[PDB]
């Protein structure tokens, strides 16, 4: 029996592979390959031209197949993993590509949070997706997502890159061969990603409080290492910015809207029965979730906001506990879609057939008719 | 002591005020408290951290807005004290709180704690000599000048039908759903994320409210607008950009008629009016269907009356005359009728003096107004 | 080898004949989930019935199929019967005769469609429909007395003297447990705890089943509850939230004795029993005042026999021996009586065979019901 190609997009890195395969075969970024392109334009973009996205998706999915899948898009099923709240135009463009240029047997625009829940095997939890563009919370109860309870914040990987760019541009101590600030008006994203993973890290809760005291009248941890850069443009990172980058990620700014506060907000809109079961089942997926100390500071921030006199009288004493998925947090949703794609029993009837799309054109989405 | 009575028409979205006899409330503004995003450490920015109305609308991208009233229930009493004080301040009335009579409005079935705390404020902080916490449906009947009628108001947080037949309010025929304008804006933002644009702030949410108030039509058949392609009427953002809204402008007001599509359990506006009439007596339904009084700001959608006529024709029995009376002053019918009621001479027995409130307290309020 | 199924408007007490306690005890509820465009995956059912819907109650919408003893949805009731037979008792209904319990003064369509379903859908060989009060009298070990049954959707009184019924002195009142649940829900909303959706109705009825008792002197108890506060007890929701209820405890079952709180314009249960006694013959009223039997789940309130005895004592003459019989097993009196009846040596001629339904049809139930 045929397999199922599980395609997962993303603004930063796309994930793809086969069905049943533990872990995807390749994780290629959302960049392109074209002549005369000094900076490869991302494939996953919104509020832009229609035909341009059609061509971008054609070439990207084409090179994705022919470079990391080694199979013709006609012999096996395709389960396109897309997170919920994705723009309808983007989904329609994906459907047009997969049914007008590749002609796959059946696509399946399955949600991300639901399959992330499928990885653990349990049927109900609270899923915090720390994606690239925005953060996303979607409570799932008995396999059904509580869609009216949602939460988004532009504090994903993009906000971390914006923070690192501005802050490193300020204390730009690029040695000669001593300061040399603003040598270049803008720095790329690859060096910024390397600074995030290899040098930046998540602080502690007490350390975060010390940073809060350091905001206005001291940064207690000072470790730093001079990050190199090609062309002998060696810069020097600071021992406090490696803390401040995560501090803006866990900042509130008198609006009570942090990454950890979003889970409590969605828990507040959830019904009374679902409360303790979502507290007893917490799942943290996403790419930003792979930072050292992120889960510890995250859980500490949750429990620190529990006794807050604004959310305590409705939540109170709860048993918060984070699950450990059998895959990496950056690629959990793909493994859920892989286990779902490896289920050839009802997927032939659950997914959208090719014949129905060619003779109908209507795409199923949570909208009337 | 006696002066001109003030009708402080509260509400979940637009707190309205003005003296009695006035046919237009000269001091209306959205009900919220403005505080800047970054916590102030010094001056040189939005000073005082307290913006309401015009000074609140002075800046949008530099404020964190906190609503004080949600679903007709006051969550932050301090914020409501500051908004009431803003009404008595140098920019809204420039009068004295301990001199003028004050009328007050409240949605039905509200908790007693709200009324008790509200009278504690209006009898301890602002020692008003006359306080009468009236309702929000009876006032619309006074504004329209009609005896019978089914008041279907729709503010920002509460939509409730109270069928009053010739001055007799039937309490067991009251249907009350906690869905209105604020939730319409929330699910409108949810649909806007499907369109492509995103909003993540309270002031940004008020920008979404402006998007809602400009273009949101209710077709009789939303599937017809779904099959066809809308022309995507643009909207010039207050920031300076433009947004092609699309189908979300009509998919969002479907909430008030089909809340089961999103995932919330309620009956809808059409079923609120229908079940409110069905809970009444058998001899009054024929007259209550022909006497429907609209109110509130959420009843200001293009094609609202037509779709409501179609849905009531679906639920009500055949050959029954229906008259959905839609006045022009729906956004101020509660305040206008409150002014008419407060201007009456029999209205003197309705309020409670300061000494009278000090006699018993909570029980004095609940006994004299009910 | 007979099956005794007690289908009320709330629980569905089912089990085998001859047994003391029934096997199946579950809330007769069906529920469809929140139909959204999103999917679920890895399987789930289409409509949860019984404890399935009771545990997964956080997202599904509770829809009772029986309203005031009237089966309002035959497909949902058919789902509950299929769940009962093939899942709670784990035995097909073709190998056994069944015994159903309907309320008195029940519209004939229910009594006939019930038989049509039990024969055409399940292919049962014999089915009998008995009045719940008669079975309560069987389980009470008496052949003389009046049964004041009170379910969640119906409440009736049936006087039976020396095994003979009085079909004209049978009263019926729709003021039962579900109306009490709605009243408690409204007053809990009045104290500041909004229990809006149907999923919250199970929590408010749990509050009713745990902390609600019948006050002896309602005015004295209400005055002391407004005076003191020791009567105010606490309770925990499924969440970590904790509430406190002061009046609600004793003011919740007060509607049973005072229907004016719900606008029913009727008589309380005590005077309903009194009128049901007065409609009998003057020579057999002593036995009815002595053998007054309470049954059903709505009579499980702590301290209710004292209220019934005091009210009837005030109504009945001074030379009468007012005696209230309230067994601790009155929550299953209908089922126990069904067990006794089904296991009798005489009842075999009282069935309705399959060929009898094949010949006559649905009209044989009225000539064979009672
Ligand atoms: N301890 C209790 N105190 C007060 N009310 C209770 C208690 N236990 C159960 N109830 C109420 O009694 C009702 C139970 O209904 P019941 O057991 O009478 O079944 P039913 O479906 O009404 O059928 P039937 O009337 O034939 O038994 C429920 O509405 C419940 O709220
Ligand atoms: N090994 C890693 N350690 C820490 N952060 C990582 C790691 N790998 C990726 N990331 C972060 O994850 C983000 C990618 O998230 P992604 O899954 O692409 O979001 P989306 O849900 O939009 O696809 C990047 O911005 C990067 O900063
Ligand atoms: N023209 C309009 N179009 C769409 N929505 C409106 C319009 N006018 C008002 N609204 C909505 O109705 C609300 C105002 O209703 P109102 O009766 O003033 O509420 P309240 O009684 O709580 O003050 C606003 O919050 C707004 O969301």
UniProtKB/Swiss-Prot annotation, chain A:
It is found in: Cytoplasm, Cytoskeleton. Pfam families: Actin (PF00022). GO terms for cellular component: axon cytoplasm; dynactin complex. Disulfide bonds: none annotated. Gene3D superfamilies: 3.30.420.40, Actin, Chain A, domain 4. One of its GO terms (biological process) is retrograde axonal transport of mitochondrion. Keywords: Cytoplasm, Cytoskeleton. Subunit of dynactin, a multiprotein complex part of a tripartite complex with dynein and a adapter, such as BICDL1, BICD2 or HOOK3. The dynactin complex is built around ACTR1A/ACTB filament and consists of an actin-related filament composed of a shoulder domain, a pointed end and a barbed end. Its length is defined by its flexible shoulder domain. The soulder is composed of 2 DCTN1 subunits, 4 DCTN2 and 2 DCTN3. The 4 DCNT2 (via N-terminus) bind the ACTR1A filament and act as molecular rulers to determine the length. The pointed end is important for binding dynein-dynactin cargo adapters. Part of the dynactin complex that activates the molecular motor dynein for ultra-processive transport along microtubules. Belongs to the actin family. This is Actin-related protein 10. The lineage of its organism: Eukaryota, Metazoa, Chordata, Craniata, Vertebrata. The gene is ACTR10.
Swiss-Prot record, chain B:
It is found in: Cytoplasm, Cytoskeleton; Cytoplasm, Cytoskeleton, Microtubule organizing center, Centrosome; Cytoplasm, Cell cortex. One of its GO terms (cellular component) is cell cortex. Keywords: Acetylation, ATP-binding, Cytoplasm, Cytoskeleton, Nucleotide-binding. Transmembrane segments: none annotated. InterPro entries: Actin (IPR004000), Actin/actin-like_CS (IPR020902), ATPase_NBD (IPR043129). One of its GO terms (molecular function) is ATP binding. Signal peptide: none annotated. It comes from the Eukaryota. It holds the Pfam family Actin. Part of the ACTR1A/ACTB filament around which the dynactin complex is built. The dynactin multiprotein complex activates the molecular motor dynein for ultra-processive transport along microtubules. Part of the ACTR1A/ACTB filament around which the dynactin complex is built. The filament contains 8 copies of ACTR1A and 1 ACTB. Interacts with dynein and adapters such as BICD2. Interacts with BCCIP (isoform 2/alpha). Belongs to the actin family. ARP1 subfamily. This is Alpha-centractin.
Curated annotation (Swiss-Prot), chain C:
It is an enzyme of class 3 (hydrolase). InterPro entries: Actin, Actin/actin-like_CS, Actin_CS, ATPase_NBD. The modification Methionine (R)-sulfoxide is found at residues 39, 42. Belongs to the actin family. It comes from the Eukaryota. The modification N6-methyllysine is found at residue 79. This is Actin, cytoplasmic 1. In vertebrates 3 main groups of actin isoforms, alpha, beta and gamma have been identified. The alpha actins are found in muscle tissues and are a major constituent of the contractile apparatus. The beta and gamma actins coexist in most cell types as components of the cytoskeleton and as mediators of internal cell motility. The keyword DNA-binding does not apply. Actin is a highly conserved protein that polymerizes to produce filaments that form cross-linked networks in the cytoplasm of cells. Actin exists in both monomeric (G-actin) and polymeric (F-actin) forms, both forms playing key functions, such as cell motility and contraction. In addition to their role in the cytoplasmic cytoskeleton, G- and F-actin also localize in the nucleus, and regulate gene transcription and motility and repair of damaged DNA. GO terms for cellular component: actin cytoskeleton; actin filament; adherens junction; apical junction complex; axon; brush border; calyx of Held; cortical cytoskeleton. Its EC number is 3.6.4.-. The modification Tele-methylhistidine is found at residue 68. GO terms for biological process: adherens junction assembly; apical protein localization; axonogenesis; cell motility; cellular response to cytochalasin B; establishment or maintenance of cell polarity; morphogenesis of a polarized epithelium; positive regulation of double-strand break repair via homologous recombination. Keywords: Acetylation, ATP-binding, Cytoplasm, Cytoskeleton, Hydrolase, Methylation, Nucleotide-binding, Nucleus, Oxidation, Ubl conjugation. It is found in: Cytoplasm, Cytoskeleton; Nucleus. ISGylated. PROSITE patterns: ACTINS_1, ACTINS_2, ACTINS_ACT_LIKE. Its main location: cytoplasm.
């Amino acid at each position: 029996e045929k397999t199922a190609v599980v395609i997962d997009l993303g603004e930063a890195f796309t994930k793809c592979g086969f069905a049943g395969e533990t872990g995807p075969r390749c994780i290629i970024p959302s960049v392109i390959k074209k002549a005369g392109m000094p900076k490869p334009i991302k494939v996953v973009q919104y509020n832009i031209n229609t035909e341009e996205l059609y061509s971008y998706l054609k070439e990207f999915i084409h090179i994705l197949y022919f470079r990391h899948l080694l199979v013709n898009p006609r012999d096996r099923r395709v389960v396109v993993i897309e997170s919920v709240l994705c723009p309808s135009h983007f989904r329609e463009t994906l459907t047009r590509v997969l049914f007008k240029y590749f002609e796959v047997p059946s696509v399946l625009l399955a949600p991300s949070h639901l399959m992330a829940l499928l990885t653990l095997g349990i049927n109900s939890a609270m899923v915090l997706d720390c994606g690239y563009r925005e953060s996303l919370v979607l409570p799932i109860y008995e396999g059904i997502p509580v869609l009216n309870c949602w939460g988004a914040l532009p504090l994903g990987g993009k906000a971390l890159h914006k923070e690192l760019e501005t802050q490193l541009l300020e204390q730009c101590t690029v040695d000669t061969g001593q300061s040399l600030p603003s040598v270049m008006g803008s720095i790329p994203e690859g060096v910024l990603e390397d600074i995030k993973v290899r040098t930046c890290f998540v602080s502690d809760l007490t350390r975060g409080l010390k940073i809060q005291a350091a905001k206005f009248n001291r940064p207690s941890p000072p470790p730093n290492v001079d990050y190199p850069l090609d062309g002998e443009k060696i810069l020097h990172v600071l021992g406090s910015i490696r803390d401040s980058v995560v501090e803006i990620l866990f900042e509130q700014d008198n609006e009570e809207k942090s990454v950890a506060t979003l889970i409590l907000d969605s828990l507040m809109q959830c019904p009374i029965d679902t409360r303790k079961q979502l507290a007893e089942n917490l799942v943290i997926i996403g790419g930003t979730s792979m930072l050292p100390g992120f889960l510890h500071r995250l859980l500490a921030e949750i429990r620190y906001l529990v006794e807050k006199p604004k959310y305590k009288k409705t939540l109170g004493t709860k048993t918060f506990r984070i699950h450990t998925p059998p895959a990496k947090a950056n690629c959990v949703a793909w493994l859920g879609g892989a286990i779902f794609g490896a289920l050839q029993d009802i997927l032939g009837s659950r997914s959208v057939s090719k014949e129905y799309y060619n003779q109908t054109g209507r795409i199923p989405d949570w909208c009337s008719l | 002591i006696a002066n001109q009575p003030v009708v402080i028409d509260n509400g979940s979205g637009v707190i309205k005020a003005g003296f009695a006899g006035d046919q237009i409330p000269k001091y209306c503004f959205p009900n919220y408290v403005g505080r800047p995003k970054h916590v102030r450490v010094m001056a040189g920015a939005l000073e005082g951290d307290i913006f309401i109305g015009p000074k609140a609308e002075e800046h949008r991208g530099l404020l964190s807005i906190r609503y004080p009233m949600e679903h007709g229930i006051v969550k932050d009493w301090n914020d409501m004290e500051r908004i009431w004080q803003y009404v008595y301040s140098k920019d809204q009335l420039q009068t004295f709180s301990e001199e003028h009579p004050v009328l007050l409005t409240e949605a039905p079935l509200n908790p007693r704690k709200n009324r008790e705390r509200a009278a504690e404020v209006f009898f301890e902080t602002f020692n008003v000599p006359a306080l009468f916490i009236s309702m929000q449906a009876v006032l619309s009947l006074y504004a329209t000048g009609r005896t019978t009628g089914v008041v279907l108001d729709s503010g920002d947080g509460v939509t409730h039908a109270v069928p009053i037949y010739e001055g007799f309010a039937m309490p067991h025929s009251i249907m009350r759903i906690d869905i209105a304008g604020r939730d319409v804006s929330r699910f409108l933002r949810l649909y806007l994320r499907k369109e492509g644009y995103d909003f993540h702030s309270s002031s940004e949410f008020e920008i979404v409210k402006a998007i809602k108030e400009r273009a949101c039509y209710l077709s009789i058949n939303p599937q017809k607008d779904e099959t066809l392609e809308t022309e995507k009427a643009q909207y010039y953002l207050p920031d300076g950009s433009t947004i092609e809204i699309g189908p979300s402008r009509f998919r969002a007001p479907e909430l008030l008629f089909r809340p089961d599509l999103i995932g919330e359990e309620s009956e809808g506006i059409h079923e609120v009016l229908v079940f409110a009439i069905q809970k009444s007596d058998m001899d009054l339904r024929r007259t209550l269907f022909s006497n429907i009084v609209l109110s509130g700001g959420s009843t200001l959608f293009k094609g609202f009356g037509d779709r409501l006529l179609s849905e009531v024709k679906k639920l009500a029995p055949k050959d029954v005359k229906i008259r959905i009376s839609a006045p022009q002053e729906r956004l101020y019918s509660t305040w206008i009728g409150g002014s008419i009621l407060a201007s009456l001479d029999t209205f003197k027995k309705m309020w409670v003096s300061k000494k009278e409130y000090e006699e018993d307290g909570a029980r004095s309020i609940h006994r004299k107004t009910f | 080898a007979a099956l005794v199924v007690d289908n009320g408007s709330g629980m569905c007490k089912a089990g085998f004949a001859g047994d003391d306690a029934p096997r199946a005890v579950f809330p007769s509820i069906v529920g469809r989930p929140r139909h959204q465009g999103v999917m679920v995956g890895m399987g789930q059912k289409d409509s949860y019935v019984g404890d399935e819907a009771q545990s997964k109650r956080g997202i599904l919408t509770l829809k009772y199929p029986i309203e005031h003893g009237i089966v309002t949805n035959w497909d949902d009731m058919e789902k509950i019967w299929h769940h009962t037979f093939y899942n709670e008792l784990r035995v097909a209904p073709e190998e056994h005769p069944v015994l159903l319990t309907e309320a008195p003064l029940n519209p004939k369509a229910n009594r006939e469609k019930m038989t049509q379903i039990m024969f055409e859908t399940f292919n049962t060989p014999a089915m009998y429909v008995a009045i719940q009060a008669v079975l309560s009298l069987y389980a009470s070990g008496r052949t003389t007395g009046i049964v004041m049954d009170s379910g969640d959707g119906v409440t009736h009184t049936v006087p039976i003297y020396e095994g003979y019924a009085l079909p004209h002195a049978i009263l019926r009142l729709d003021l039962a447990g579900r109306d009490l649940t709605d009243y408690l829900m409204k007053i809990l909303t009045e104290r500041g705890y909004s229990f809006t959706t149907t999923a919250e109705r199970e929590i408010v009825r749990d509050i009713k089943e745990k902390l609600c008792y019948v006050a002896l002197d309602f005015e004295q108890e209400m005055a002391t509850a407004a005076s003191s506060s020791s009567l105010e007890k606490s309770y925990e929701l499924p969440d970590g939230q904790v509430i406190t209820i002061g009046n609600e405890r004793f003011r919740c079952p007060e509607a049973l004795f005072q229907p004016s709180f719900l606008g029913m314009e009727s008589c309380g249960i005590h005077e309903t029993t009194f009128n049901s006694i007065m409609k009998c013959d003057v020579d057999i009223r002593k036995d009815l005042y002595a053998n007054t039997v309470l049954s059903g789940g709505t009579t499980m309130y702590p301290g209710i026999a004292d209220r019934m005895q005091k009210e009837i004592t005030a109504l009945a003459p001074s030379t009468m021996k007012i005696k209230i019989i309230a067994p601790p097993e009155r929550k299953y009196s209908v089922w126990i009586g069904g067990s006794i009846l089904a296991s009798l040596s005489t009842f075999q001629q009282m069935w309705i065979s399959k060929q009898e339904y094949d010949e006559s049809g649905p009209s044989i139930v009225h000539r064979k019901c009672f």
